Amino acid sequence: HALENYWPVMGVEFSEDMLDFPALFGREAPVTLEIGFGMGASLVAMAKDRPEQDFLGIEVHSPGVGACLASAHEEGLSNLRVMCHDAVEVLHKMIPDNSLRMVQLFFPDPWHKARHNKRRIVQVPFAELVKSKLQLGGVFHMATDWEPYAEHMLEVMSSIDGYKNLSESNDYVPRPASRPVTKFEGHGVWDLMFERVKLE
């Protein structure tokens, strides 16, 4: 019942119009986007802990959207909105340039098989697209539990002018407060965080 009940309140329909964040959230505040939020546990925890900030989630899996809405309602959140649509299209059509404080991409589909390597969302064009939507100093934070994907992510991100690795060892970062531990959580999870800086 969560979708029918709470989609009218917290859902955002896809359109070819750029989002007005002040209009959407009813105030001027930092916006964090989580792509592929799944059941939304991280996103709800994030929004609950940061009532002074605003949060957008995008997830193609509609039961995940429903679960996220149910949890957000259970926590009485007013600072969370969700979409059920391909995030790439939302980024292109609805997210203004230079507008986001942070983009989170946690455990994106790992596509273990080499035959599926191109299905992995972290590729140069996607990473460039995300970059264009971050404010300077904004961060793209991704995490994976598959080392081949982690290495691919690092290669992609390291190749892009305008991304600065926040890793003190030029690869991975420790898990920040802004990502929750997994039930099973080196220790087998890789976090990557890159800040947007001016083109060199």
Ligand SMILES: Nc1ncnc2c1ncn2[C@@H]1O[C@H](CSCC[C@H](N)C(=O)O)[C@@H](O)[C@H]1O
């Ligand atoms: N293009 C896209 N747009 C929005 N969501 C996407 C997407 N491609 C994959 N996803 C979603 O990304 C999620 C990755 S599974 C990880 C889910 C969640 N972050 C967690 O850690 O539990 C899936 O739910 C999948 O539906």
